[PDB]
Amino acid sequence: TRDFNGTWEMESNENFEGYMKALDIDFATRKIAVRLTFTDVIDQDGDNFKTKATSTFLNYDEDFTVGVEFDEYTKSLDNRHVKALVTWEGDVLVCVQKGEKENRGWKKWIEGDKLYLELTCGDQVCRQVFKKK
Amino acid sequence: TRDFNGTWEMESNENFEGYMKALDIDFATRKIAVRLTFTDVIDQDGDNFKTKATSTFLNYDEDFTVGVEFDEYTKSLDNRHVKALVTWEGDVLVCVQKGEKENRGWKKWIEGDKLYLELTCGDQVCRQVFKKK
Amino acid sequence: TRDFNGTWEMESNENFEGYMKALDIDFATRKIAVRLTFTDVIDQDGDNFKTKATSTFLNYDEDFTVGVEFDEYTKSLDNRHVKALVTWEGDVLVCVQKGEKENRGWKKWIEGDKLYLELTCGDQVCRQVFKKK
């Protein structure tokens, strides 16, 4: 068919960095464009085309069951192999990521309708607070 | 007028990188801000102001008629001027972009309900598959 | 409570770069990840978790009343402390940012239905024009 009308969400993106490298794009923008997904909207009236490609960030997914130690490759941060276990300690969700780094993990707990998350690695701690919508 | 209330979308941004370099901003973050557009929301209560600037990536637009050679400035990627012509090759939309780069263009075609796009430049080719919403 | 179901919007993110630096993450991806805000969707069925992390850009806010000299931290740009005051020059909103840099500030004014913004620092000036929606 010759009908390209519609809104198209990307499901695959192969050799994006090689194509961008052929265009002489800098390394910083290259490592950021490989972390994006694109949605192209196309209006076609016979031979007249209007196309706009919207770019968004790739959505990171993590599914797990409490008590089952699963293999995790942090494809979002440092790309390392860790073995992660999520445990219940009272009402605090505790997770340990055993690997090259020590004291690495995170801890979640809820207060009212705000979520508190502590990302730990070594002696460094990152604190993030979320509100519920 | 002194009334600044409303939502304001950026249409032009001249010498942003020079201004940021004067602010001693690192090169990586500068190369990320040169690819953004801004939308500012303004609340004005007499002399009271509340401002929020939303940042997004500039979206690539391509409007054309098959067979008509149009001038295209390839923002979002390499910022180059090419002269592009779109042809029908069977049911495949073929486009050639004459410019500094050779073998540069793209090819779209539909199979089933998936859109396939092949971006080529030099000896590098990028393959993209899209699903309809 | 042990119920984490829902959509959680980030409101605070402390020491994200230190945590990422402890993970040996490169400087480019760190300076873009020190931006951004995160929204995590969590579906919890007893002990089974399914999480999706949506990424967007950090907005950065600046709220002020005309005539009060306020402390401003340019988190959107260079992360410096300046003391900024916004003045009226006719119908033009003028603001000067006294700090480590000199001749630093901005000027906004409306003509027709377009907002004109001049970012100045050193001998470099950036001009931005916005249209109203």
Phi, psi of A20 (to 5 degrees): -65, -35
Residue C43: CB atoms within 10 A of its CB come to 13
Point out which residues pair with A98 in neighbouring strands: A83
Q: List, as ranges, residues 47-106 from A with C-beta within 8 Å of B.
A: 47-55
Chain B residues within 8 A of C57 when measuring between CB atoms: 36, 54-56
Query: In Å, how far is C99's CA from the nearest CA of chain A?
Result: 29
Domain boundaries, position B22: 1-133
In the numeric block, the tokens 């306020």 are attached to C70
Helix (H, G, I), strand (E, B) or coil at B61: strand
Taking the C-alpha atoms of residue B123 and residue B19, their distance in angstroms, rounded to an integer, is 37
From chain C, the residues in CB contact with B14 under 8 A are 126-128
What order of strands is seen across the sheet that includes strand B48-57?
A: C61-65, B48-57, B36-45, B6-14, C124-132, C114-121, C105-111, C92-98, C81-89, C70-73
Give the integer Cα–Cα distance in Å for A93 and A107.
5
Backbone angles phi, psi at A130, to 5 degrees: -120, 145
Residues near C27 by beta carbon (within 8 Å), at least 6 away in sequence = B26, B28
Residue B64's DSSP bridge partners are A49
What does each C-alpha distance from C10 to A31, A128, B29, C80 come to in angstroms? Answer: 24, 7, 22, 23
C109 touches A at CB < 8 Å = no
C93 backbone φψ class: left, alpha, beta (φ>0; ψ -120 to 50): beta
> A66 to chain C, minimum CA–CA distance in Å?
5
Which amino acid makes up residue A60? Y
Pairing of strands C70-73, B60-65: unpaired
For residue A18, the one-letter residue type is G
Q: What CA–CA distance (Å, rounded) separates C35 from B109? A: 37
The answer to whether residues C91 and C77 touch, using CB atoms and an 8 Å cutoff, is no
Chain A neighbors (3+ CB pairs < 8 Å)? B, C
Give contacts of A53 with chain B, Cβ < 8 Å. Answer: 59-61, 76
Contacts of B112 in chain A (CB under 8 A): none
**Between B1, B19, B53, which is nearest C76 by CB?**
B53
CB contact under 8 A, B108 and A4: yes
d(CA C109, nearest CA chain B) in Å = 8
State the total domains in chain A: 1
User: Which residue, B126, B124, B131, B94, is CA-closest to B109?
Assistant: B94
> How many Å apart are CA C64 and CA C86, to the nearest integer?
8
How many residues comprise chain B?
Answer: 133
Reduced 3-state DSSP string for chain A: CCCCCEEEEEEEEECHHHHHHHCCCCHHHHHHHCCEEEEEEEEEECCEEEEEEEEEECCEEEEEECCCCEEEECCCCCCCEEEEEEEEECCEEEEEEECCCCCCEEEEEEECCEEEEEEEECCEEEEEEEEEC
Strand order in the sheet with A60-65: A60-65, C48-56, C37-45, C6-14, A124-132, A114-121, A105-111, A92-98, A81-89, A70-73
- C-alpha span between C73 and C37 (Å, rounded): 18
Contact B89, B108 (CB under 8 A): no
Task: Please tell me which residue of chain C has the smallest CA distance to B48.
Answer: C65
Residues of chain B contacting A7 with CB distance shorter than 8 Å: 132-133
Report DSSP state, residue B59. Answer: P
Put simply, the answer to whether A61 touches C53 (Cβ < 8 Å) is: yes
Are B61 and A40 an interchain contact pair (Cβ–Cβ within 8 Å)? Answer: no
In terms of phi and psi (left: phi > 0; alpha: psi -120 to 50; beta: otherwise), the region of B35 is alpha
Q: Give the H or E element holding residue C112.
A: none
Question: Tokens representing B35?
Answer: 């690819």
Q: What is the resolution of this structure in A?
A: 2.8
User: Do residue A28 and residue C24 have CB atoms under 8 angstroms apart?
Assistant: no
Tokens 């690819």 — which residue? Answer: B35
- Across A36-71, b (16+ Cβ under 10 Å) vs e yields eebbbebebeeeebebebebbbbebeeebebeeeee
Residue B32 burial (10 A CB sphere; 0-12, 13-18, 19+): buried
Task: Flag whether residue A129 sits within 8 Å of chain C, measured between CB atoms.
Answer: yes
Asked if C9 and A131 come within 8 Å (Cβ–Cβ), the reply is yes
User: Residue C26 and residue C63: Cα distance in Å, rounded?
Assistant: 34
Which residue is associated with the tokens 């490298």? A21
- Helix (H/G/I), strand (E/B), else coil: C103: coil
